[PDB]
Symmetry: C3
Subunit: 143 residues, 3 copies
């Protein structure tokens, strides 16, 4: 089975959509259309186990984010921004089992900490892909 996407944040002078999925509005690859660049949500169509990774630039404020499945945090990440003149970085990742129509997204989970960033020479990316399908070959006999 095939399911994969990767997207990055556009540069922005406004604060990032918070307490809601964070859109990564600039798509690198989304052949199945399983990622929605308007909403920032990945929607599952193939049941299976997936890897998700965020590689973020942090600037002007600390960054906290959650990887979220169906409104609940899978895993949470944080990088302190110590008032430095140039950006820092934060990556997070996890695997999760999904069923069709389950949704996964990135969300800032605490108020102050929305320092995610992108610029000419920095980016913040969100990627996800199916590692194996849970439609097994002998679905009735075994499993």
């Amino acid at each position: 089975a095939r399911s994969a996407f990767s997207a990055k944040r556009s540069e922005s002078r406004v604060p990032p959509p918070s307490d809601a999925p964070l859109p990564f509005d600039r798509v690198l690859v989304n052949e199945q259309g399983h990622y929605d660049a308007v909403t920032g949500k990945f929607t599952c169509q193939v049941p299976g186990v997936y890897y998700f990774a965020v590689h973020a630039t942090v600037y002007r404020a600390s960054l906290q984010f959650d990887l979220v499945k169906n409104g609940e945090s899978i895993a949470s990440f944080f990088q302190f921004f110590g008032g430095w003149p140039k950006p820092a970085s934060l990556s997070g990742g996890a695997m999760v089992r999904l069923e069709p129509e389950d949704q996964v997204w990135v969300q800032v989970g605490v108020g102050d900490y929305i320092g995610i960033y992108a610029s000419i020479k920095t980016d913040s990316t969100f990627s996800g892909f199916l590692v194996y399908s849970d439609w097994h070959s002998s679905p009735v006999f075994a499993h």
Copy 2:
């Protein structure tokens, strides 16, 4: 073939098991049981090439960790903790070829540097998965 897992660290007031595998005791997904959340070790059952990734929170002390195969470091990672009021972050990852019964785990490789952390809004995750199997289709004729 199928082999994947992902797990995270529980919050702890005690120092992390060191000079021994680091348990990530809270399992996100381990359908084959190839990861052992008690020991922190992944044990291979399908020969092949695997990706492993650690996404760690760092707090109160710097963090050094090794990704280890059969007791020897594959790759080593480090993040300085500059006495900041809130956590920093450290990710590491690599691919490795494994044969059945090979074991992979995370270990703190230097004494002082055991600042791995988890809390209400931070986590440290360990994930791994088979990318392709080395049981080829024409195993005798070629390869």
Copy 3:
């Protein structure tokens, strides 16, 4: 289909090759020979969607790097080095669609910022792998 590699940087007292691919000269796994440890370039032989990840140690200078496809940046990453006594860290990653003979590599994209590092207990790794092939099963009828 099978395509994967992972490699790490050797310790060096000289500045890293810049404005050119960065060699990760120490190979962990490259069964297809799709990665060239001499040039630092991955060359595609199977069309499909790939994940690439860099997990770098940063020391003595800030680090900027781009993940590059055919001479153009896919995504750019940065970590400030605040003059600390010990290293910091920077990870970056993205997915991209490739066709045979396309090349992917890591490059430092800005002059001052070449603080990538490796030592006895730190590494910088570059990994990439095919997630799914774009040689579909019904290539004419559909797609």
